[PDB]
């Protein structure tokens, strides 16, 4: 319960550049 892993960022905006 104390070991929260690095969760996924599921809302990735579009990158420009």
């Amino acid at each position: 319960e104390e070991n929260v892993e690095e969760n996924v960022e599921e809302n990735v905006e579009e990158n420009v550049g």
Partner: antibody
Amino acid sequence: EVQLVESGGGLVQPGGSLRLTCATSGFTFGSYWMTWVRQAREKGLEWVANIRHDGSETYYVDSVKGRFTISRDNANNSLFLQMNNLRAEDTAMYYCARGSGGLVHWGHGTLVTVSS
Amino acid sequence: EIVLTQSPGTLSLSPGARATLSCRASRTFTDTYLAWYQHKPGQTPKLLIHGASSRAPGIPDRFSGSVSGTDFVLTISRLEPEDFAIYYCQQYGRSPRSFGQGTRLEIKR
């Protein structure tokens, strides 16, 4: 009983170095994530860094990237926070906590003062 | 990054009253990896609620939490003299697992 004891740290000048140690006992060390948290004078709590159980993944707050390094030795039950190139705004009380989510078990906290 | 902003800045109530502390995020909440902490000056911080609505071990029943949409609320049903302190919310789903700026719960007179 879960025991967390922060050591190291003290008075240092800008650009100096300090190595914090969080000697743990009372639980399987290599089975838990570990976390460093600090709080400066007249400011709020700030999450600094955490490390996976096997030390293969480390994450940092932006203000300490490239300067602070979190590490661990699971055979010695010790969590480390190598602080290089310290700044005046790094002056705070540094706590080590168990886990990576809701931090239940905290240490007493060691004081780091950076000033010229 | 998601930034947590707590409301109000200072909460002034009397013992026995009902306390409601807010914690709003830059965008809509998408998980329950949220916590509430209590901090008294000179004393070690203390977890009150994890998982957005689960009381930590030993926390009295008068502490309860809930999350909905863009607001994360801590509720103290009746204020005990030992409850006036500083309260921080926190997200811990992923990096950075940052806190709120803090809410000062003072005594009203």
